[PDB]
Amino acid sequence: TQVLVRNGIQAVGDGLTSLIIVGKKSVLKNVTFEGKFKEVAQKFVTDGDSWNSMISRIPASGRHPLHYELAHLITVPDASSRGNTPTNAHSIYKELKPINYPEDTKNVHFVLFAEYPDVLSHVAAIARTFCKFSMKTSGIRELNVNIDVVCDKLTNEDAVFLTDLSESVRETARLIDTPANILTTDALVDEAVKVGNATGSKITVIRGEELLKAGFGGIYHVGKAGPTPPAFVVLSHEVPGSTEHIALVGKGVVYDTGGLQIKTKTGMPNMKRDMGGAAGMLEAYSALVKHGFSQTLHACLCIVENNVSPIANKPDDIIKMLSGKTVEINNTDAEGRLILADGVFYAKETLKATTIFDMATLTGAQAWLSGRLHGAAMTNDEQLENEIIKAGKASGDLVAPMLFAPDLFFGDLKSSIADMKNSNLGKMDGPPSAVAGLLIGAHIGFGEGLRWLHLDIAAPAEVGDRGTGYGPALFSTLLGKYTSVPMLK
Amino acid sequence: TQVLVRNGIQAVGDGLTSLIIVGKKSVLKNVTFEGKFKEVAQKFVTDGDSWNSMISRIPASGRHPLHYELAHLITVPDASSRGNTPTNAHSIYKELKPINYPEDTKNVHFVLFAEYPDVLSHVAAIARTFCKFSMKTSGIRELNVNIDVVCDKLTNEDAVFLTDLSESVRETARLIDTPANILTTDALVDEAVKVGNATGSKITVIRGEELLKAGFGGIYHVGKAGPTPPAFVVLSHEVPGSTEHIALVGKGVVYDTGGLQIKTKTGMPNMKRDMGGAAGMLEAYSALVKHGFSQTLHACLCIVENNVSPIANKPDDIIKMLSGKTVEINNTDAEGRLILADGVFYAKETLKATTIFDMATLTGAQAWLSGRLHGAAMTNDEQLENEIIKAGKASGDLVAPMLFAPDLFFGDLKSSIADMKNSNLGKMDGPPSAVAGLLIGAHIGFGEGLRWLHLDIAAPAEVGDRGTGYGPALFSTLLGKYTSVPMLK
Amino acid sequence: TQVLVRNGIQAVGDGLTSLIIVGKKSVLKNVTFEGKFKEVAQKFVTDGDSWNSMISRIPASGRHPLHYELAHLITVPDASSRGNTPTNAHSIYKELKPINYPEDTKNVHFVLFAEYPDVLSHVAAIARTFCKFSMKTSGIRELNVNIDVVCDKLTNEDAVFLTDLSESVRETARLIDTPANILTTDALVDEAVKVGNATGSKITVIRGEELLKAGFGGIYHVGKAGPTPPAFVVLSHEVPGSTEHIALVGKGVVYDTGGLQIKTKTGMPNMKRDMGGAAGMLEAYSALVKHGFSQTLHACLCIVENNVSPIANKPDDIIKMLSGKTVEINNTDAEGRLILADGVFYAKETLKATTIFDMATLTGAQAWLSGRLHGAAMTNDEQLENEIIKAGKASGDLVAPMLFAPDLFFGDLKSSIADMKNSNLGKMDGPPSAVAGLLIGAHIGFGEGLRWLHLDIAAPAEVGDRGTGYGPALFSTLLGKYTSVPMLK
Amino acid sequence: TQVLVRNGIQAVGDGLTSLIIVGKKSVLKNVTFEGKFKEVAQKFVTDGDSWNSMISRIPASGRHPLHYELAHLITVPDASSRGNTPTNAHSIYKELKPINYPEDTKNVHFVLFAEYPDVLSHVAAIARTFCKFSMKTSGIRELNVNIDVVCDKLTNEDAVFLTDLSESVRETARLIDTPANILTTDALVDEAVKVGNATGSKITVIRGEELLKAGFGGIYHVGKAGPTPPAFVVLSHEVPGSTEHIALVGKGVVYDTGGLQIKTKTGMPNMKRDMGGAAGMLEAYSALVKHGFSQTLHACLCIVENNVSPIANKPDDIIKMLSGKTVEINNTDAEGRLILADGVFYAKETLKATTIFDMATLTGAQAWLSGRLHGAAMTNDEQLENEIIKAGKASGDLVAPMLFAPDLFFGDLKSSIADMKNSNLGKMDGPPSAVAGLLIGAHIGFGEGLRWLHLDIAAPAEVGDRGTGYGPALFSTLLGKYTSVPMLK
Ligand code: NA
Ligand code: NA
Ligand code: NA
Ligand code: NA
Ligand code: NA
Ligand code: NA
Ligand code: NA
Ligand code: NA
Ligand code: NA
Ligand code: NA
Ligand code: NA
Ligand code: NA
User: Fold this and answer.
1) Which residues are CB-neighbours of D313 under 8 A, at least 6 positions away?
2) Binding site for Zn(2+): which residues of A?
3) How far apart are CA C73 and CA C139, in angstroms?
4) D255 near A CB under 8 A
5) Are D461 and D468 in contact (CB under 8 A)?
6) Active site residue C466
7) φ/ψ of residue C19, rounded to 5
8) At what angle do helices C276-289 and C185-198 cross, to 10 degrees?
9) Closest to A113 in 3D by CA, of A9, A35, A4
10) Which amino acids does the record list as binding Zn(2+) 2 (chains A, B, C, D)?
11) Is A137 within 8 Å of chain D by CB?
């Protein structure tokens, strides 16, 4: 299935077409049934009077069929709470995701009526619903999707960006949805390298025993018992004399069994999704670099499978991290933070990054802090905390803040015989998701001298059985000021 | 044990004395061993040279004995993270709480060297360690405690307030520590009424069958299976023509067995502490009204015991709340929010309050959102959120924010046959502590037209086996601008 | 069913008879098939040659049928380990308990060939298998049982005692087997009072609110939520000028639901058996007093039902015990030790007992210390420990020692606000069964100045669905030197 | 850190010194502040009057600071219960273990005032607190420790022994504290062989496939799925014509995952400590052989890692042990007893040992039998049981007895298709720790014809996060009569 975003309603190809019209209630109320819109909608909506009659009847929000199988109107609510995004983009996903198209549909045409601040999140929300990945052996259909945005301020360049963003989102989700017997560590390295090639990036791959020799103790010891070897992948977009030097570090655990402290029967399904941070960072980097990204930018992907064998990490093991610090592993199901500790230290010490983001599906505890729609962000920089919250609202990739208090909470990871433990298995003073973040931060002085932000996306990275493709939209809006894209400025 | 706070070092009575000196490292470094301080300290510290030598040796923070049994120096750290209070008052508690005084000690003299912004939190932290409640049948000692604050800006009026604050804190903790076979609903009503009498308040007490008749369905049906009857207590401090009308609503569950959905063997000890919100609000109200509180203020205490009998609430029961809305009870261990729903509705509709705080020990989930030191605050008013966080830092009663999003999260409480359920027993989109708060808020339109703040203090209300007395310090600093107290302005 | 023990083989009444022959292998090898034995056995065993042939063939131990339905030989092993009784009496129970008698059997004749040191335990083991209690509404048969002991040293007076012992054993078991809807606290008081009347004892009964007024806080507060009231029953056998003053304190929890810390679905069946200590002490007292007991002896029965209501003990409650000491109840399923604390204090302070035994079915932990056949004894007196172990071997009511170390283990029950907790819900330094015993002992200074022995019989009090009647045999052999019975001297 | 024990107070080197004075209250009361003691203590204690004043004030027991950071007095209680050791040596550990020394301390000087029967346990208790093992990457300090014993009867030869005992204890603990990714089976073989070399022992190492070929089915099949191979190590100290032939068999499970019946998330941390028996036996053997051990003595170390792979033991597997008997493995987490069964059989049949001790960290059930301070000893020899209990009191390595009853309890291990099962997964008649011991004993006829003692030290081998170094002190005092050491005679 191909997805193209266009600036303005246009005709779609020949072939059975499904029409979905999307807009906030107040916007739809001001739409005139005339011109190109009439031409597209008249197949399903009789005339202007019947249009206005229907718009009057329909509630503040919802989904309404315009045909027995080929058409729908999605009404997005106007009102929103302060903790939500005023775009209400999740409402689009909620109403659209259940929609199926008849077997013989060739095209899906979306007519999106949106004010400029809503367009990006609305387009992303639609894109998320075209799930690339399936291994069904019948019924597979490829569709031609046109998302036609009706917005005065929108430019043709904005539409190119939105098409690229739609791809980045669908690619993140595809990588997440792919089972780990297919997306092995080797396969995810290959996916990253493909983006590396396409972006003209400087590519570094440190694999298997090379990780051990170079001192990546976290990445190596976590992944050493995988069926394919651990890897650290760096894609670098180096801009001589740039004022910023930004690293996007992603957790790429292609599967987590929990290790020797094994996950339960019901807790181990879905653990293919534990590479969602890596996938999100990779595809964010791709979307930004496609659009004239003016600063130095690195994607740093820590790629392992955490599995079970006589050579695996055992609780009690002490390893030496890239930082030179030692970690007592008391929890093999808390391994993601170990590989990220090496990734973030590399970003600081080797790449000389001064803004370091790490994004990961870490803890089930994250949903108890920020719920299922908001990523949980912990940062040493208050201004960056506010900026990423703002970016979450603008993108629809929602972000809520975590307490930053290493002085109060890092004691939860005290060890008698190593510099720290990787986890606390009992009662702790910090929120567990914060404590997980602090393990990572302990290896770069909790961000001292620079800006460090840790982002836990365990729950918002998925809805039901499907990856959401969280990450590209957030970082596009957060870092979009460094691109050529009008709507991101 | 009596606790007096004084403005300046003074002599203490005759009798064996234990000396504890407290200060931040940078403050202690500038203390001259001379004058009244020398007079007090020279019992234990030889001269000025030995003083300075010791201060040089001792680390950034800690506790150091000045005698084999009668004396200690507590060093408070200067540095603090952004998520912590810059007072670092919890460090005082941590170092002081373990200290025991010899059996024959008559006096405990504290010399507190503190800058003005630190004084209140530091004094509170010391007060917390003088636990009133004990039923030991030997070894009980009453001590005369003098907390002598050395601070230039401190006034004599400030010291009166700080003595009253110390009492409010120790009283909150006493009520929390008292077992529920002693502090029954009747006993807690009596305690509230005593404060009501002393404050010259207008006192309302609605009890037992009177609650049912008046339509308090939450308070009544939760508490109807207690060994003593449920009660709603209002203390009102009415100031004609005041611009603010503030209600402090407190959860006063004197014991929670969990109800018919009974708590576990290990989960039911400590449930005497489920009235910590009521105790904290009562003692905050007392401290404020003692100091010329210039606005209309109400304490609203919802006082029940949640126990097990054939007449208790059962999951599936539907009751009608004071609001007129119906609630399907699917969780009898989520009963605190029911009584608070009536309390907050009463505050809005009967008391005409325009600022409504509710404070409660609600969920174990709160610790997973904000950790064990920070209360979790959910409010419809962003400015109030910032103000209470600031008050948390100033008071040492730390506060962290919860997401406010009824649109995203209230759906977690959907019911097919009542207006809402009281809880969600599976997977929900909101943080569980937020969802608990939203149950309460649903009965006043989530604060619409006014300011509503819900504060979950489950974990910060206690450390180990002892109540902390959380609440009075927070509200003193938050609402202290309406008092006559110089340090609160 | 009636059970008579006779000194020598005699004829039994007319009516269908079942014959069971019992002996150690070495004893049976020396039995001549002649005389009264021939007369009894020749119904089933052809002649002396066929007897000797069979005895040659049969292994070291087991059960062998002598008829298709009416007759068996039980061979008891000669060898035994040092931790077992050399009587090997449990082997008799093991082989005999499964035996059923045809519906129309009128008599059961046992010929027991036993050396003098084996007789008591062997007779008790046989008696245990005649279970008094049944509420089956068909098939109930009353049998005439004659246990004919063949032992040179046995006297006619010994046979009277053994008949009384058989009754005491069967009575203990009957009381244990009776469901608690029948054997209520009132019913068990009545049973105790009946023994009191028959023994010519001085009877004291303190019940219901009288317990509270007299300060029995343990007995009262544990039992106050029962459907029938708590009671303390004392039967006293006072011998002016006796050198010993002995109290037998028994735990008579007629049913334990666990209280508010309720027992599990699978853990609550069998809790009618939690009065086995009371039943055992009552029936031991009866057997001793029937035979000219020369010392002052008291049975002290603490009789409660531990159930669930709004007035029940809650974890966190603090109560004042008869001793005047306070106990913080953190575990309502650890209630038996509370009532025993009052019983033992009463025995010391009111009865002036100088030897105090308490016997109780306390913890499931007891089986992890001493297994399922041995009671676990904790005592301040080493000589008494050895003596009761010796008595266990002689009686077949096996006893193993527990560590006695209040200095090392009593800290497991530390409380911040009462003199002690009743239990420790986590990790403790002592064996849990020892710690349970120490709760009781803490109220009499752990036996200081006297002899105190605590005996936990949780597992040996029952096999499968039936009470064993543990207790009477142990105390008969332990204290039998004070009776007129030749075999007990 | 080096530890030297000296006979008498002497000067310590130049460098910042920490002073700790240790004694029972009654001993300290008779200490004169004069001479060498005055010289050492005067830095911290003013004069003799101030000394005596302090000793008067201080309670029966405790720890009292003599300086703000450099000095402490530890008072040991005089009184002890019969189940405790009258040395009260655990009180020293309890008070001393929390003590930290300033970063720049060079020396720690201990002045131990102890009567002769207390010296060994007191010295050991101090030694235990100098934990060798740490992988912290900052803050590591090596100290010079002098334990100066003040005891009239003490000889210079006794002080050499006590220095060697301190080393044996600290070495046991070091081996225990070392994570299993470092102390592999190969590493522990190497450690054993080093002791072998130093002691001039005859050394046998049977490794990997050699174990299978030689018929060590227990050792081989348990360890075959380790990342490094299983091993059996024998160190032999052969004394021609000795009357005793003693084997010390130790369980050296370098890590236990539980095997295919895997341990839980919270139950698997600490399982590096499952080689505590091997470490204790090795270091006991070292201390004895260093001091002219006059009998034939063997250390037999069974060294495996129990891990998870397709070739691991599975429940249901039947293996053939060194004894020739078959064992049905129904519990892969009960593997330690399998390797010990081969060790003890080897000791009997190959080494011709007539006194066989096995020591192991076996079951969590051990703490429910004997608590956390006492090893649980099960032996066929009553005299040896009494002797080891006595040795436990004399050494401070406490020992409590387990029931010995193979006739009553071995039936818990009945199998239909092998000679026995290795465990019982349900209800059993024996204490589980006894039943575990009986598995081992079943392979040498439960000790028939010789003396066999099984010692379960699961809990006393550790306190908190640290190995105690249990074993060397016990066996020094038990077998010390065969050495040249005056204090052991
Ligand atoms: Na199809
Ligand atoms: Na994980
Ligand atoms: Na993971
Ligand atoms: Na006292
Ligand atoms: Na509750
Ligand atoms: Na509650
Ligand atoms: Na019948
Ligand atoms: Na119980
Ligand atoms: Na009980
Ligand atoms: Na350092
Ligand atoms: Na094991
Ligand atoms: Na093991």
Assistant:
1) D221, D222, D224, D225, D259, D260, D319, D329, D332, D335
2) 251, 256, 274, 333, 335
3) 25
4) yes
5) yes
6) no
7) -110, 125
8) 10
9) A9
10) 251, 256, 274, 335
11) no
Classified by CATH at the fold level, domain D155-489 comes out as: Aminopeptidase (3.40.630)
As a whole number of angstroms, the longest Cα–Cα distance in chain D is 77
The shortest CB-CB distance from D181 to any of A317, A333, A416 is to: A317
Instruction: Report the C-alpha gap between C125 and C115 in whole angstroms.
Output: 15
Half-sphere exposure at residue A2, Cβ-oriented, CA atoms within 13 angstroms: 7
C456 is in an annotated binding site: no
Helix (H) or strand (E) holding C451: strand C451-456
A89 and A373 Cβ atoms separated by less than 8 Å? no
Q: Residue B488, by phi and psi: left (phi above 0), alpha (psi -120 to 50) or beta?
A: alpha
| A367 to chain D, closest Cα gap in Å | 21
Amino acid at D187: A
**Closest alpha carbon to C302 in C269, C344, C266, C273:** C344
For residue A326, which of D354, D138, C385, D176 has the smallest C-alpha distance?
D138
Task: Name every chain B residue with its beta carbon within 8 A of the beta carbon of A432.
Answer: 368
Residue of C nearest to D389 (CA): C403
Phi, psi angle pair for B145, to nearest 5°: -100, 125
- 3-class SS letters over B21-82: EEEEHHHHHCCCCCHHHHHHHCCCCCCHHHHHHHHHHCCCCEEEECCCCCEEEEEECCCCCC
Beta pairing partners, D207:
D231
Resolution value (Å, 1 decimal) = 2.0
Cβ pair A431:B382 closer than 8 A: no
3-class secondary structure, A341: helix
CA–CA dist A27, A21 (Å, integer) = 12
How is domain A1-154 classified at the CATH fold level? Rossmann fold (3.40.50)
Q: Which helix (H) or strand (E) holds A234?
A: strand A231-237
Best CA proximity match to A358, nearest among A468, A257, A280, A242: A280
User: C365: which residues sit within 8 A by CB, 6+ positions away?
Assistant: C431, C432, C433, C436, D368
**Best mutation target, B24, B78, B81, to test chain A (most A CBs within 10 A):** B81
For residues B45 and B55, the answer to whether their CB atoms sit within 8 Å is no
Q: Given the DSSP bridges, would you call strands C326-328 and C318-320 parallel, antiparallel or unpaired?
A: antiparallel
Domain ranges of chain C: 1-154, 155-489
User: What proportions of chain A, in percent to the nearest 5, are helix, strand and coil?
Assistant: 35, 20, 40
**Ordered alpha helix ranges (H), A290-404:** 336-349, 366-370, 382-395
Task: Judge whether D335 is annotated as a binding position.
Answer: yes
Reported residue count of chain A is 489
The H or E element spanning position C205 is strand C202-207
Q: Which residues pair with D63 in a beta bridge?
A: D74
Q: Exposed/middle/buried for C153, CB within 10 Å: 0-12, 13-18, 19+?
A: exposed
Element containing residue D49 per DSSP (H, E): helix D48-57
Residues 6+ apart with CB under 8 A from A132: A1, A170, A171, A173, A174, A177
Residue D6 phi, psi (nearest 5): -120, 150
Task: Give the C-alpha separation, B447 to C344, whole Å.
Answer: 60
CB B108, CB B127: distance < 8 Å:
no
Helices (H), D361-485: 366-370, 382-395, 406-409, 432-441, 472-479
Please list, in sequence order, all residues whose beta carbon lies within 8 angstroms of the beta carbon of residue B210, skipping any fewer than 6 positions away: none
Distance CA A52, CA C483 (A): 107
Residue C463 in contact with partner chain D when CB distance is under 8 A:
no
Two tokens, residue B217: 């369905």
What is the spatial distance between Cα B314 and Cα B471, in angstroms, rounded to a whole number?
32
Q: Are D233 and D192 in contact (CB under 8 A)?
A: yes
